[PDB]
Amino acid sequence: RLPTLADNEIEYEKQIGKGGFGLVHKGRLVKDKSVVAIKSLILTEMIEKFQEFQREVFIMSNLNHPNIVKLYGLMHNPPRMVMELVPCGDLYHRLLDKAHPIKWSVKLRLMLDIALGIEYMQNQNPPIVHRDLRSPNILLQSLDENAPVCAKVADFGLSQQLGNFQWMAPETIGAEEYTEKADTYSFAMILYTILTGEGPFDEYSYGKIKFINMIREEGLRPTIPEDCPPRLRNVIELCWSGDPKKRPHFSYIVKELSEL
Ligand SMILES: COc1cc(C(=O)N2CCC(N3CCN(C)CC3)CC2)ccc1Nc1ncc2c(n1)N(C)c1ccccc1C(=O)N2C
């Protein structure tokens, strides 16, 4: 069910950078001069990004949400994906401009959008576990509060490997197949980052072994600010609990966020 396009159908422009497993470029459809994005594999059995390639394609193909990144077609020599280029960037970089803070109305917009996207992912039979949810993977479409969509979820090769474990739910570390509650834990981290603008767990320096243990065994988490809404705090705290069971359904998270 997914179109194939030929090289004569798209025009390359400039290279955006690496997303997920590949290299993203900015391009346009020749028929329409509409902008598009092309994802390709970049060159010892690590070239197992190929599965990530296929995995991303399969998953993107069957999904359709405003808050989820879309796929348009495929290209073949070399194998490539033509997908949407989100215009405004990624969340990680945006949070790096401290001089210019994101507006609360907007931060709220971003949080909801992500939840709506993730809520949708988990309503699938079977559910979709992203597994690589962190700020670099949240793409921004508009930073305007009145826009239909502000944030979109991305990077669907479902692998794990700012990316090391600050973002990972505890059962997940040093494990392979990662329920959907892992994502809930990650989402909490994302909520924490949008709110604070500071990366998760950056207030601590522990060696790797100690750090895992602190998170797994002791319960260490980031410190939420005193001036954080109780409604929001409560939500974050739940999603990031040690017991995966205590983590909420996205129905709850979304509703609560809406009241904020
Ligand atoms: C207008 O297009 C975008 C621009 C930017 C952007 O401004 N960046 C990102 C990387 C960039 N680097 C280049 C040089 N710099 C000195 C170091 C880092 C810095 C600033 C970021 C994202 C953009 N849009 C975009 N749309 C769809 C994506 C995707 N991104 N990427 C890169 C992905 C990123 C993560 C996960 C998935 C994707 C992806 O699949 N797509 C299709």
Swiss-Prot record:
Residues of the full protein shown: 1019 to 1292 of 1726
Protein kinase domain sequence ranges: 10-260
Top-level taxonomy: Eukaryota, Amoebozoa, Evosea, Eumycetozoa, Dictyostelia
This protein's encoding gene: roco4
Binding site for ATP: 16-24, 39
Family listed: Belongs to the protein kinase superfamily. TKL Ser/Thr protein kinase family. ROCO subfamily.
Residue positions of the active site: 132
Source organism, top-level taxon: Eukaryota
Name of this protein: Probable serine/threonine-protein kinase roco4
